[PDB]
Structure 1
Amino acid sequence: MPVAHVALPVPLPRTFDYLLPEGMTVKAGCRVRVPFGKQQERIGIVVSVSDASELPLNELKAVVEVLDSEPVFTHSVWRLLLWAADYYHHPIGDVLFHALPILL
């Protein structure tokens, strides 16, 4: 066939990049709505807020709305969840999203 789905020994934090809007300030631990490929919206969690992107800041999928002004995860829980994903080898995303429910 044409497409090979390959497994790589990829880094630890495999996330996606989205341009933060003007006057729209958000920090890590807060849920946000971002477009997902050829399509419409889908919720996600901000892990980092850098000022550099792997791709041009021109052809970079922008953001939409900030569902939280204050991180749903505490510095405490956050330190703990990121530690669990690293120590026990679980994707950050999976640990974060599967933890949110139990938290609430």
Structure 2
Amino acid sequence: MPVAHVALPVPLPRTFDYLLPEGMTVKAGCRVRVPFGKQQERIGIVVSVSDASELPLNELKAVVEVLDSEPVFTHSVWRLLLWAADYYHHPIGDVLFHALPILL
């Protein structure tokens, strides 16, 4: 058949890059609505903000809107969760979202 879905041992935090439009600011631990797939949106959680993407600064899509001015996560809670993710081999996205509810 066509598409071979393959598995690879990507680096620890597997994240998806998106560009921040002019004047839009967000820090680590903030929820943001971003594009996903040819047309729908979805809530995500910003893990970090760098000045380098594994692909060009132009074919990355842009965040649509920040939903939190301040981290929905405690400085401690955040450090902890990222650790657990890494220590027990769980994807950051999975820990973070499954962790959001219990928190609120």
TM-score, with structure 2 as normaliser:
0.96
How far, CA to CA, are the matches of 1:22 and 1:9 in structure 2? Answer: 34
SS of the aligned residue for 2:57 comes to coil
How far, CA to CA, are the matches of 1:59 and 1:88 in structure 2? Answer: 33
Q: CA deviation at 1:36?
A: 0.5
The range that moved more, 4-13 or 44-53, is 4-13
Q: CA deviation at 1:21?
A: 1.6
Q: CA deviation at 1:5?
A: 1.1
Deviation per CA, 1:3-31: give whole Å up to 9, x if none: 11111122111100111121111001000
Gap regions ≥5 residues in structure 1 = none
* Aligned alpha-carbon RMSD (Å): 0.8
Ranges of 4+ aligned residues in structure 1 off by more than 6 Å: none
Deviation per CA, 1:36-89: give whole Å up to 9, x if none: 020121100000100111111111111110000000011100011011111111
Q: Which residue of 1 aligns with 2:32?
A: 32
Q: Which residue of 2 aligns with 1:52?
A: 52
Q: CA deviation at 1:90?
A: 0.4
Identity of aligned residues (%): 100
TM-score, with structure 1 as normaliser:
0.96
